[PDB]
């Protein structure tokens, strides 16, 4: 459901937070299904993604910051408290998906 | 710095988002400093205030909504994602302030 957002000039939660496509994008995108190898029974959670991110991500840049994002202004000192959440999230891959 | 905005006929971020003063305001405002009791070292963040609101609010009305304010058209499903921010913010009180 996120291959739609990978295009020059589109918004979302992945195209703006993991890889920003500039307007002058002359590259090619190749995608295919290989669900028989990268997904197993029991819940495949080795792949992580960044759904929470502060502002944006510059084109052709990589962000690997694991700092807990702050929503309000109360600091959490890196715990699972209130008004903060850990930015990386796990996928929901399953070999019996649609 | 926000006692200035508490007056009938003034704008800002507190007098328009927390308590609106009508034109026919005949009440009295009493303010004083008690920083030796409501503040402590290490950061006193027990007091909250609102920064974002969808629109104007009626005078003498209290808003306690904790819903995440949406700035655009992409829903967030109540997370700290993109194009949305938490309206509630904590103060920066300190006993060693000016």
CSV table of N, CA and C in Angstrom, one decimal, chain A residues 35-74:
chain,number,residue,atom,x,y,z
A,35,UNK,N,7.6,-12.6,-1.8
A,35,UNK,CA,7.1,-12.9,-0.4
A,35,UNK,C,7.4,-14.3,0.0
A,36,UNK,N,7.9,-15.2,-0.9
A,36,UNK,CA,8.2,-16.6,-0.5
A,36,UNK,C,9.6,-16.7,0.2
A,37,UNK,N,10.3,-15.6,0.3
A,37,UNK,CA,11.7,-15.7,0.8
A,37,UNK,C,11.9,-14.7,2.0
A,38,UNK,N,11.3,-13.5,1.9
A,38,UNK,CA,11.5,-12.5,3.0
A,38,UNK,C,10.4,-12.5,4.0
A,39,UNK,N,9.5,-13.4,3.9
A,39,UNK,CA,8.4,-13.4,4.9
A,39,UNK,C,8.2,-14.9,5.3
A,40,UNK,N,8.1,-15.1,6.6
A,40,UNK,CA,7.9,-16.5,7.2
A,40,UNK,C,6.8,-16.5,8.1
A,41,UNK,N,6.4,-17.7,8.5
A,41,UNK,CA,5.3,-17.9,9.5
A,41,UNK,C,5.9,-17.5,10.9
A,42,UNK,N,5.0,-17.2,11.8
A,42,UNK,CA,5.3,-16.7,13.1
A,42,UNK,C,5.4,-15.2,13.3
A,43,UNK,N,5.3,-14.5,12.2
A,43,UNK,CA,5.4,-13.0,12.3
A,43,UNK,C,6.8,-12.6,11.9
A,44,UNK,N,7.0,-12.0,10.7
A,44,UNK,CA,8.3,-11.5,10.3
A,44,UNK,C,8.4,-10.1,10.7
A,45,UNK,N,9.2,-9.9,11.8
A,45,UNK,CA,9.4,-8.5,12.3
A,45,UNK,C,10.9,-8.1,12.3
A,46,UNK,N,11.7,-8.7,11.4
A,46,UNK,CA,13.1,-8.2,11.2
A,46,UNK,C,13.2,-6.9,10.5
A,47,UNK,N,12.1,-6.6,9.7
A,47,UNK,CA,12.1,-5.3,9.0
A,47,UNK,C,11.4,-4.2,9.9
A,48,UNK,N,12.1,-3.1,10.0
A,48,UNK,CA,11.5,-2.0,10.8
A,48,UNK,C,11.4,-0.8,9.9
A,49,UNK,N,10.5,0.1,10.3
A,49,UNK,CA,10.3,1.4,9.5
A,49,UNK,C,10.0,2.5,10.5
A,50,UNK,N,10.2,3.7,10.0
A,50,UNK,CA,10.1,5.0,10.7
A,50,UNK,C,8.8,5.6,10.4
A,51,UNK,N,7.7,5.4,11.2
A,51,UNK,CA,6.5,6.1,11.0
A,51,UNK,C,6.4,7.4,11.7
A,52,UNK,N,7.1,7.5,12.9
A,52,UNK,CA,7.2,8.8,13.6
A,52,UNK,C,8.5,9.5,13.2
A,53,UNK,N,8.4,10.7,12.8
A,53,UNK,CA,9.5,11.5,12.5
A,53,UNK,C,9.2,13.0,12.7
A,54,UNK,N,10.2,13.8,13.1
A,54,UNK,CA,10.0,15.1,13.6
A,54,UNK,C,9.4,16.1,12.6
A,55,UNK,N,10.2,16.4,11.5
A,55,UNK,CA,9.7,17.3,10.5
A,55,UNK,C,9.6,16.7,9.1
A,56,UNK,N,10.7,16.3,8.6
A,56,UNK,CA,10.8,15.8,7.2
A,56,UNK,C,12.2,15.2,7.0
A,57,UNK,N,12.5,14.8,5.8
A,57,UNK,CA,13.8,14.3,5.4
A,57,UNK,C,14.2,14.8,4.1
A,58,UNK,N,15.4,15.4,4.0
A,58,UNK,CA,15.9,16.0,2.8
A,58,UNK,C,16.2,15.0,1.7
A,59,UNK,N,16.0,15.4,0.4
A,59,UNK,CA,16.2,14.4,-0.7
A,59,UNK,C,17.6,13.9,-0.7
A,60,UNK,N,17.7,12.6,-1.0
A,60,UNK,CA,19.0,11.8,-1.1
A,60,UNK,C,19.7,11.9,0.3
A,61,UNK,N,19.0,11.8,1.4
A,61,UNK,CA,19.6,11.8,2.7
A,61,UNK,C,19.1,10.6,3.5
A,62,UNK,N,19.9,10.1,4.4
A,62,UNK,CA,19.5,8.9,5.2
A,62,UNK,C,19.5,9.4,6.7
A,63,UNK,N,18.5,9.0,7.4
A,63,UNK,CA,18.4,9.3,8.9
A,63,UNK,C,18.3,8.0,9.6
A,64,UNK,N,19.2,7.9,10.6
A,64,UNK,CA,19.3,6.6,11.4
A,64,UNK,C,19.1,7.0,12.9
A,65,UNK,N,18.5,8.1,13.2
A,65,UNK,CA,18.4,8.6,14.6
A,65,UNK,C,17.4,7.7,15.4
A,66,UNK,N,17.8,7.2,16.5
A,66,UNK,CA,16.9,6.4,17.4
A,66,UNK,C,16.4,7.2,18.6
A,67,UNK,N,16.6,8.5,18.6
A,67,UNK,CA,16.1,9.3,19.7
A,67,UNK,C,14.6,9.3,19.8
A,68,UNK,N,14.0,9.2,21.0
A,68,UNK,CA,12.6,9.2,21.2
A,68,UNK,C,12.0,10.6,20.8
A,69,UNK,N,11.1,10.6,19.9
A,69,UNK,CA,10.5,11.8,19.4
A,69,UNK,C,9.6,12.4,20.5
A,70,UNK,N,9.6,13.7,20.7
A,70,UNK,CA,8.8,14.4,21.6
A,70,UNK,C,7.7,15.2,20.9
A,71,UNK,N,6.5,15.0,21.4
A,71,UNK,CA,5.3,15.6,20.9
A,71,UNK,C,5.0,17.0,21.5
A,72,UNK,N,4.9,17.0,22.8
A,72,UNK,CA,4.7,18.2,23.6
A,72,UNK,C,6.0,18.8,24.0
A,73,UNK,N,6.1,19.2,25.2
A,73,UNK,CA,7.4,19.8,25.7
A,73,UNK,C,7.9,19.1,27.0
A,74,UNK,N,7.1,18.2,27.6
A,74,UNK,CA,7.6,17.4,28.8
A,74,UNK,C,8.6,16.4,28.4
